[PDB]
Amino acid sequence: DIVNRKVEHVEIAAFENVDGLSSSTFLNDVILVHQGFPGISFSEINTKTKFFRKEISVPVMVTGMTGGRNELGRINKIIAEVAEKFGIPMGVGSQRVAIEKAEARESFAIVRKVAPTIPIIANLGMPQLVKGYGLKEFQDAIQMIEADAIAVHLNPAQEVFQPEGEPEYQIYALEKLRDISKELSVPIIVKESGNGISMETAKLLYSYGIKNFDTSGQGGTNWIAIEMIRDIRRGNWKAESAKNFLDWGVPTAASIMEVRYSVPDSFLVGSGGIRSGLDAAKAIALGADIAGMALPVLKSAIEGKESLEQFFRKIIFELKAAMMLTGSKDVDALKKTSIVILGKLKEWAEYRGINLSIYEKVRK
Amino acid sequence: DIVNRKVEHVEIAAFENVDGLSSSTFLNDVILVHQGFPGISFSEINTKTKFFRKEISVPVMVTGMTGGRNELGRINKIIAEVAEKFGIPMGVGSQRVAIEKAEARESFAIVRKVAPTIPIIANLGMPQLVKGYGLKEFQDAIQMIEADAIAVHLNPAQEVFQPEGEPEYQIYALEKLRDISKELSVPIIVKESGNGISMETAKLLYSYGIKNFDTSGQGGTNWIAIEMIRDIRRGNWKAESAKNFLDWGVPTAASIMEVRYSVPDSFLVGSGGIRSGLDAAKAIALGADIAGMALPVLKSAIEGKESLEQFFRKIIFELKAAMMLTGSKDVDALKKTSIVILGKLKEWAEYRGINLSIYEKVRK
Amino acid sequence: DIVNRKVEHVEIAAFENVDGLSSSTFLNDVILVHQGFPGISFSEINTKTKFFRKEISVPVMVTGMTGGRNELGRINKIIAEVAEKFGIPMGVGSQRVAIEKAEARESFAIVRKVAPTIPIIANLGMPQLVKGYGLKEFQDAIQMIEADAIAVHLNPAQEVFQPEGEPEYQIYALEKLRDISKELSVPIIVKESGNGISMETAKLLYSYGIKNFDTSGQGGTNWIAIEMIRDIRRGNWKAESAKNFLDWGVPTAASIMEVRYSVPDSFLVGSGGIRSGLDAAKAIALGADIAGMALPVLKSAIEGKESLEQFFRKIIFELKAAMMLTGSKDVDALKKTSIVILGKLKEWAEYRGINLSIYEKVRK
Amino acid sequence: DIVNRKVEHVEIAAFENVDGLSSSTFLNDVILVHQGFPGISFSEINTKTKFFRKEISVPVMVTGMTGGRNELGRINKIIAEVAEKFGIPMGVGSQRVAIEKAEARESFAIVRKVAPTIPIIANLGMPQLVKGYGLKEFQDAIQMIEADAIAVHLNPAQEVFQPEGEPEYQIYALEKLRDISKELSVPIIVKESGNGISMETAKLLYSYGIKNFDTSGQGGTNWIAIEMIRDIRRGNWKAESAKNFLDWGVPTAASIMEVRYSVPDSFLVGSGGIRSGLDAAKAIALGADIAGMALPVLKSAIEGKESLEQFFRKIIFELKAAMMLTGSKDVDALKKTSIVILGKLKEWAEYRGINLSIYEKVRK
Numbered sequence A, B, C, D: 001d002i003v004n005r006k007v008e009h010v011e012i013a014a015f016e017n018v019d020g021l022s023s024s025t026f027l028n029d030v031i032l033v034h035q036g037f038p039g040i041s042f043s044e045i046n047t048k049t050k051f052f053r054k055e056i057s058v059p060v061m062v063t064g065m066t067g068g069r070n071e072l073g074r075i076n077k078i079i080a081e082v083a084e085k086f087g088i089p090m091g092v093g094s095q096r097v098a099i100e101k102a103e104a105r106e107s108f109a110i111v112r113k114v115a116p117t118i119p120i121i122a123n124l125g126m127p128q129l130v131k132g133y134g135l136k137e138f139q140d141a142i143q144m145i146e147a148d149a150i151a152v153h154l155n156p157a158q159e160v161f162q163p164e165g166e167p168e169y170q171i172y173a174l175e176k177l178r179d180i181s182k183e184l185s186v187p188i189i190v191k192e193s194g195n196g197i198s199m200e201t202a203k204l205l206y207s208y209g210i211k212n213f214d215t216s217g218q219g220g221t222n223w224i225a226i227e228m229i230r231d232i233r234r235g236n237w238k239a240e241s242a243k244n245f246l247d248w249g250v251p252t253a254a255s256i257m258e259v260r261y262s263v264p265d266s267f268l269v270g271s272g273g274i275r276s277g278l279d280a281a282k283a284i285a286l287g288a289d290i291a292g293m294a295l296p297v298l299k300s301a302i303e304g305k306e307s308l309e310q311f312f313r314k315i316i317f318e319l320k321a322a323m324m325l326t327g328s329k330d331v332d333a334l335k336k337t338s339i340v341i342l343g344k345l346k347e348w349a350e351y352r353g354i355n356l357s358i359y360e361k362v363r364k
Ligand SMILES: Cc1cc2c(cc1C)N(C[C@H](O)[C@H](O)[C@H](O)COP(=O)(O)O)c1[nH]c(=O)[nH]c(=O)c1N2
Pocket: A009, A010, A013, A063, A064, A065, A066, A092, A093, A094, A123, A151, A152, A153, A191, A192, A193, A194, A216, A217, A219, A220, A221, A271, A272, A273, A274, A292, A293, A294, A295, A296, A298
C-alpha cells in the first residue's frame, strides 16, 4: 500500500505533466561567460572528481527515486548498470518500504549486485526519524546495498499535501540524526525533494553536524504537483489547496547560492530541474560540487538501458561543451569560471543579504 | 433606493468580472522562504491570536460587506453563523442604511443573534461624518449589533465614480472622528475599500489618534470597476473615465508595507485580494497582524452555509501549510519569518523611502 | 502643395494607425499615490492656473496642429470655439503656409474671431529660421491671430524622413531666435513634435534665452510613422528606413523629467500621448506646468463641436478625479503630490544622472 | 568536401531560420538620446573614417563569409564590386580551402581584381594555427588578395557542434600568432563568429600583442544553429545538444562594452546582428570604431548587384539619420554622443564590474 504509492509516484512523475509545473529553477538567470579563446583542447578536458572516498567519472549523480517492488527494482537495475558503466554515483529511493517489508529488499539490493564499484547512496525520510527509526534502521538501509553514504530527505511540502502524509518535523529528529551520525560508518547527506534548501535550514543542519547537502530546488520535479494529482485522483479536497502552492519553494539556483554562502565548506549537490549538461555546468559554476538529476534519468530508464546510455552520453557531452567554451580544463576550473547573475536570481540574492562580492570569493 | 444600490453592489461583486480587474496586489512580489526542516509538526501549529480584548481562532477576519434588506440579512446570517463556528471576527456592511431606515436594522442585528461570541465590527462611511453623523449614530451602529469595534471606511475613489457619489473628505471629518473616539466604548478601525492606504494617509490618521488600520489595497475587489458597471448600466458618461482609473490605488502588499513602516505600533489588517491561506500568510509575514477577506466570503455564502464552511477550512489549511513550511509554530513566528521582496514591490518601496533594513527590523 | 501635405498630415493622423505606434510615453512607469483620505471635497477642487499673463480654467492646452485651407480652418474653428468655452489655451498649426500664400490666412485668423479671450499660440518651424524667416515673419504669424505667444517647433526626425523634408538645424538658427526674442512683444515656446526634448537640447536652448518648453515626447502621435506612410504612399525607399526609427525619441515622461531637472525654472508643457485626464495629471505631477494634447482633440473636432465638448468634459473630470484621489485641492498641490517612479523610466533617469532625491526637491 | 560545407554554410545561412534564433544582441537595451536641436544640417554630415592606413567612406565593413568554389566566387565578386563603389572595407571568408586546393584561389582573388582600392581583409581560422599553419600560409592568404589585414577567427562554439569540427584551442596557438605578427606586413584582427568576445578573451589576446578585435557577438547569425541544422540533416545526435546552446555567448552589445572597457585603446569592430544603420550607430556610440555586417550582405548579394547597392544605400541613410538626430556631424561625435543603457545589458555590465562612470569616460 506504501508500495502502491511507490508505483503511483513513478507513474505520475514519468507520464504526467509535473516537471517544472508553475515553477522555476532560476537557472535562466545564470549565464556562463563564453570564452572565444578557451586555451584548451576538447579532448584534454578532464571531468573526474571526488565523491567522498571514491573517484567518479563525471560531476553528476543520479539522486534517489524508487524501489520497493519488482518492476521498480527492474528500473533500479537499469539505472545502476548504466551508472556503473559511466562511473557516476547513484542514490536509491526511500528504503522505508524495505524496512517495513522484507519482500521489497531485493529491489534495492539489485543495485549493488550490478554496480559493484560506483558510490551508492542509501535513502530514508526525515519523518521516520521522529517516528521510531534510529541507528539500526540506518545501518540496515546502508548495509542492504553496501552504501557509501546515506541521504536523508526533507519533504515537508510533500507530506503536507500527501493524502497519507506525515508532516512531522520536530527538532528532536535533529538531535537523533546527530547521534546517529556518531555511530555510522558512512557520511550523511541531507537532501530536499523539489522545494530547495534555504540558508536558515542549512545553518540549522550544520549546527547539528551536517556537512553534506543536496539542494533539490523548485523548477524540476514538482512534488506538490504530484500529490495534487494524487489528491484529484481520490477526490481529496486538498487538491485545490496544493494548486496554490505549485510555485512554493527555493529555486534550485537560489538554493545553491544560499547553501554555498551560509555553509562555505559544505559538500553540495545542486539538483532540482537539472535537464542538460549545460544546467549541470551552471549549477557547479554557481557553487555546487556536483549536479544531481532524477526525473529525466527515470524517463530514459523506463525506455531501456540503451536509451539511458544515450541520455548520459548527451549530458556528458553537453557538460564538456560548457567546460570547453569557458576554458575549464577540469571540474575545479569550472567552479571558478566567469558567470553573470541577472534578473530574479539577482534580486533574490540582494534581498537575502548575499553580498555578490563575498559570494564570488566564496565559490572562487 | 440606497437599498437598491446595496443589492446592485452585491450582485455585480458576486456575478460580474470585477475581482482584480486590471489591478494587482503585488503579492506575487512577496515570497515566503521555504524551510526544508520546519522544526515543528503540523498538529502543534497554533493559529490563535488577539483581536482587541477577545481571542480569535485564526488571524483572518471577514471584512464588512452588506446589510439593509432581507436577502442581504440572510447572507449576513450565513456569514455570521459560520464565522462563529470558526472563531473568526466579522465586520458588517455600512450601517448608514439602517440609520436612515428602521426596516433595515434586522439584517444587521441578526449577526449578533447567531454569533454571540466572536468579535463583530460595525461600519459607517467617512463621508457621513461630514454630512451630519456623529457620536450618537456611531453608538447606534455599535449597539445595534453589540459590536466590539467600529470600522470607518474610506472610499473616495468609489464616491468619485459612483453615479450618486458623495466625494466629501474635508479635514473637519477627522476632527470629528477624533472627538467621537473620545466618547466611544469600543476602538475605531479605519479601512480603505479596494484602493489602499498610503503612508501619508496613515500618518494623517495617526496624528488624529487612529491606531487601527485595514489596508484594503488594490488587486482584489475593484470598486471603481463596480461603479463603472453601474455607470455603463445607466448610460452615465463617467463610465469611460472610470475605465482609465481601473488600476488606480495602492496595491495591498505596498499598503501593508507603507502602514507598518510609517506607523510601526499600528494594529494592521492586510486585505484587498486575499484569496488563499497563502495570501493570508504573505500579508501577515509582510507586516499585517491579521488578513482580511470579503468577496470570496460573499461568493461562498451565496452558495450556502456548507460551501462557506468548506471555504474557511480551505483557507485555514492553506494558512497552516504556509506556517508549517516556514517553521512558524504560531502567528508570532509567521510575522518574523523569512521573506523575499522582488520586482515592482521592491521598486515601490525603494522609491517611497522604505529602507529594507529598517523595514525588516520593524516587521520583526 | 505644401497645402496638400497639410491635408495628408491631418488625414493620416486622424484615420491611420499612428498613435503610439511602436512607441511609449513611459507614463505607465509613473504612479500617483492614492490618498484614501483626500482631506478635501470634489467641488472645492480648483483647476485654474496661469498661462503667461492670462488665467486659464484648466492646466491643459491644445497644441498646434493645422491650418492652411478651408476645411482645415473649419477644424480650427471648432477647436477654438470649444477651447474658448472651456477657458483652455490653443496653439495653431504651422503658419508657414499662410506666409507663403495669402489665401491660407483666413484658416488661422478664424481662431481669434471665435475665441477672443483664451491664450492663442502662433507656430513656425525652426528650419524656416535658417531659410530666411525672421522678425517680420514672426510678427506676421503673431499679429495674424493676435497671439499671446509663438511656438517654434523642432521636427528634425520628421524632416529627415519627410519626402520633401528640410533637415536643416545649423546653430545659426538659435542666434537668430535669440535676436528675434529681443524684439518680440510675446514670449517664445520651443516645442518638439513627437520625439521629445532631452537635457542637452533644453540646456542649449536655455543658453540662448529660451525659458518655455513643450516636451512633445514619443508615445503619442508618431511623426516618423506619418512620414513613413507618406513614403510608402509614393513608393519612396525612405519608408523601410523610417520603419527602423518608429521607436526613436525621448518618451514623454523622460522628457518631462529631463527638462524640469536641467532647467528647473522653465515653464514646461508636458505633451506627446496625453490621452486622459489621468495622463494629464501624471505629466503635471511629474514636473510639467501644463499638459498638452493634439491628436485626440483633432479626432473629436472632426466628429464635431459637441463631440469635442464631451471630450473636454471627460478630460477635465478625469483630471479632477486624479486631483481628488491625491488630495490635491489646486494645481500647485498636484505638482507636489506623491508619486512612484518604476521600471524603464527609473532606469532612464538613473543612467542620465537624474538623482531622484534632488529631483523630488526640484519638482517640489 | 570542405568545399561542400562551404556551400551548405552559405545555403543554411541564406535560406534557413538562423538569424537571431533564440539569441539576442542586447541592442534593444541601448538607446541613443534624441536631440531636437541637432545643431547641424543633414548634408554636412561626414561619415568618413580611418581603417588602418586607408580612408573609408562609412564606418561599416562587410565581415568575412565565403569563397572556395565558383558560385561562391561569383557572390564574392558582387560583394567586392559594390563595396568598392561605396568605399567600404570587405573581409573574405576563410581561405583555408584555398590553401588546401589551388582551384579555390580564383574565388578569393576575384575580390582584388574588381575592388582595387578599398581595404580587403584576409581570413584564416585559429584551429589551423594549432594544426600546422604558420607564417607562410598567412602570407599566402594575404598576398592572394593583396589584403590590408588578416582576420583570424575564433569559432570554438561552432567547432564543438560541427559534425567534422576541430575544437582545438591550445594556448600554443597564441605564441604562434604573436610570432607570426612579428613577421607580417599587415595587421591582425581577431574576430569571433556569432558568440562574442569577453573581457577575459580580449585581455588574453592583448597580452599576446593583439590590438584589433571584431566582437561578432550573439544575436545575429547563429552558428550553433547552423551546425545544429547540419547535424539534424545527417542524423547526428549532437543536434539536440546544440539546441540547448542556441543562446550561448556574449551578446554583441555586451561584447562591445567588454572589449572597449578591458582594452580601451583597441581598434574595435562591433558586429553580430547589425541589421540597420541604427544598429550600426548604436554599436559605434556604444564603443566600437566601426560596425560589421555579414548575413544581410550575403542575402542581398545573392539577389544581385543592384539589390546589394540598394541595401548599402539604406544602411548609410539609416546611419546618417541616427547621426543627424543625435547632433553627430562626424563619426567621432557619434562615438561620444549621449546614450541610455537599460535592462539586461545594464545588469550584465554591473555584474561584470563595468563601472558605468569610468565606462562613459572610456568610450568618450
Ligand atoms: C519518481 C521519483 C521518486 C522520488 C524522487 C524523484 C522522482 C522523480 N525523489 C526526489 C529526487 O531525488 C530529487 O531530489 C527531485 O526529484 C529533484 O530532482 P529532479 O528535478 O527530479 O532531477 C526522491 N527523493 C528521495 O530522497 N527519496 C525518494 O524516495 C524520492 N522519490
